[PDB]
From a paper:
To test this, we introduced cysteines at sites on the central axis of the D2–D2 dimer interface, cross-linking of which has previously been shown to inhibit channel opening by trapping the receptor in desensitized-like states. Thus we compared S729C, cross-linking of which permits the relaxed dimer conformation, with G724C which we predicted would not accommodate the relaxed dimer conformation when cross-linked. We also crystallized isolated cross-linked G724C LBDs in both the apo-like ZK200775-bound form (G724CZK) and desensitized-like glutamate-bound forms in two different space groups (G724Cglu Forms A and B). As we anticipated, G724CZK demonstrated reduced Pro632 separation (19.2 Å) compared to the antagonist-bound S729C forms, in keeping with the greater constraints on LBD separation imposed by G724C. By contrast, functional cross-linking of a different mutant GluA2(R) G724C/γ-2—which did not assume a relaxed LBD dimer when crystallized—trapped these receptors in a non-conducting state, indicating that this conformation must be distinct from that of native desensitized AMPARs.
AMPARs mediate fast excitatory signaling in the brain, and a change in their number or function underlies lasting forms of synaptic plasticity. The activation, deactivation, and desensitization of the receptor is controlled by ligand-binding domains (LBDs) which form a self-contained clamshell-like structure within each of the four subunits. Following glutamate binding, closure of the LBD clamshell around the agonist causes separation of the D2 domains, applying tension to linkers between the LBDs and the ion channel which opens the gate.
Author numbering:
A (entry chain H): 4 to 263
B (entry chain A): 3 to 263
The structure:
Amino acid sequence: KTVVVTTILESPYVMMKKNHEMLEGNERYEGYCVDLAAEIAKHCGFKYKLTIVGDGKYGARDADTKIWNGMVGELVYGKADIAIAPLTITLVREEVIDFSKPFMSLGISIMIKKGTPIESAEDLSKQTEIAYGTLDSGSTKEFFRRSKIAVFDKMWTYMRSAEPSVFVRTTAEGVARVRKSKGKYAYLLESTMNEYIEQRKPCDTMKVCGNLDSKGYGIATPKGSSLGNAVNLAVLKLNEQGLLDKLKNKWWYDKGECGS
Amino acid sequence: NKTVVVTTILESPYVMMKKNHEMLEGNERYEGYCVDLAAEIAKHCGFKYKLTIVGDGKYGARDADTKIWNGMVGELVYGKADIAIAPLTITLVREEVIDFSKPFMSLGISIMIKKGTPIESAEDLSKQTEIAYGTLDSGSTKEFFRRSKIAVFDKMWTYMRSAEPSVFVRTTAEGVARVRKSKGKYAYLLESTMNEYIEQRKPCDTMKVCGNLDSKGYGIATPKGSSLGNAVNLAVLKLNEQGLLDKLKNKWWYDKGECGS
Ligand SMILES: O=c1[nH]c2cc(C(F)(F)F)c(N3CCOCC3)cc2n(CP(=O)(O)O)c1=O
Ligand SMILES: O=c1[nH]c2cc(C(F)(F)F)c(N3CCOCC3)cc2n(CP(=O)(O)O)c1=O
């Protein structure tokens, strides 16, 4: 009767403790979602084992083989009982697994060098002295390609033809580009990482407050699982108890390195 | 079993009477964000529906004396409605008795200031007293501060609970009026969605401070075991992913706003 939790290494959601080599079981891991799992299990009454998903992916269906990979696949195919991770609640995923209400709300956001006079996607869209881009693949790029909102379609039209390319191979390449470009590159990215990067040395980037869309991370369970319902009630309870915000403060801001 | 009874609530700009409503019948008497949302949900789920305004004008809570649900939640629980399509907050006590979709709008407690004022953050307010600040004298925003064990909010609560003259107001309109008339010495704490709305209202003298203090959601609600719950949830996700919910926010807040940029 031990519940198999699948999760994914993504700081500060799930991290290896520095001393993980000298620990066993669930004690090897720490982070926002490690704490969330313990609170969920307490409030629902279950024992559990943490596992890192074998392929390191969140979960998508291969168009050509119909096969889910990532944590979604592990749920669909019987390898784990629950996923506790910053796993985006999406239609195609909700067609095959069950999601709790979100424990975190987030969206696409703008990163600038600390000190840059920009304040919105609208600002970016109607000028050209500041370049801006996204990851060369994934949901943020797809959001701009797929979108029918003029401001963002304008940004996409600028991005898809910019020379030299305004796209980067990794989030880290993106952040570095903001840092070296003396205010002439802005990076578009998931908002929790923007905030996380804003709070650590070298303390030279800012998240622009307003987000460009609204998305959530939720706890995932296979369709018809007896757990989905209680787990969902737990997520709502923890939010209202302030626990979800406490953990965000714990893992993002309490050891912040930049004062503000 | 071939007309779906939608319960909702008169709350601007979610549901409103059209100017000429008396010359109209049925669902055409109404307009607004949730009226449009109801039309999209129905089209995507393939049902016909009738808008009805909740008899008691309430969202949903248990009576202190009888423990019986009032508001739209009650109309779902006790069989009077098939679906609630309204800015109904997703909460633990409500989700125990009815089902919610994933949120179609995300929001939180926010700060309102007079347009032109050196304040932003909850943290700033907690560190000073020149600028008084308060909430509605009842409801979820007040309960958030009273309940919070987070230091900055507990500081703000300890300030508000004893501040004299009272920083609490009897109505949303009284709070707004107090911001407008206090020359920057009064900030109001209220739901982010209404703050944004008030910002788009004449005489255009209030501003929403950007970052929120907590995170909630509004969802579509159905009675437990409804056949609709699953389809409605996927319809909500599709509408978010297609950009449709954001277009509706823009329509009823900024297009029909009185202050634009
Ligand atoms: O479920 C999903 N959850 C995700 C959660 C996050 C994070 F922010 F780390 F919490 C991220 N980060 C985006 C920025 O660089 C670091 C990784 C990607 C996610 N992806 C793939 P995407 O949606 O293509 O980005 C998913 O699929
Ligand atoms: O489900 C709920 N949805 C709510 C939606 C709204 C609005 F923003 F108008 F859409 C408001 N407004 C708060 C600001 O002044 C006007 C009314 C209250 C709501 N309440 C009561 P609360 O949570 O105690 O505030 C609920 O219970």
